Each structure stands twice: as C-alpha cells, then as structure tokens.
C-alpha cells in the first residue's frame, strides 16, 4: 500500500501550477537578501 | 476607453487564485524577519 | 489604444497553463510521424 506516488504527484502539480501562475502576475520573489 | 476596471479585475482575481493556492500546498511564506 | 499586451498575454498565460497540465496527465502528444 505503498501511496506516496499520489502525495508526490499532486505537490508536484500545484507546485508547476503556481509557478506558472506566478510568472505573468508580476509577482516578485526572492527580493530580499541575507544582510545580517 | 477607461480600461483600468479590466486590468484592477485581473489583478485581483490572479492575487486570489495564487491565494487560494498557497493555503493547502503548505507553502509558509514570509518566515524572515528584518534582524538586521 | 495599443492593446497587444492583453491578448499576448492571456495567450502565454494559457499556453503556461495547459502545458503544466499536460505534464502529470500523462497525455503523450507528436507521438505521429510525418511517413508519407
């Protein structure tokens, strides 16, 4: 019963979803750097 | 020709959708604090 | 009134998203040959 195939294909998926998403937004990520 | 109704629209509606999105992806964002 | 951007953009936007459905649908495409 071994069910980690789905668990990682969904993640899978709504991750490429919002990466696709996220690019034509004109959402900016990562602006921040460490400084400390 | 005031155009800004559809791009404020689409704004918003992509905002909510990557929204929606994050929530059950456990994608916590945000976990940096200015230490600087 | 130069409104190219939308159309252009609405276009890649939905190109992005049917490919990253395409990818863990398993729906295989060009597996046909030019045999004429």
Redo the contacts between chains.
Sequence with gaps: AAALSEFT?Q???????????????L?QLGL?DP??
């Design positions: 294909d993640i899978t998926g709504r991750e490429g979803v919002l990466a696709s998403a996220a690019r034509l937004v959402g921040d400084v400390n």
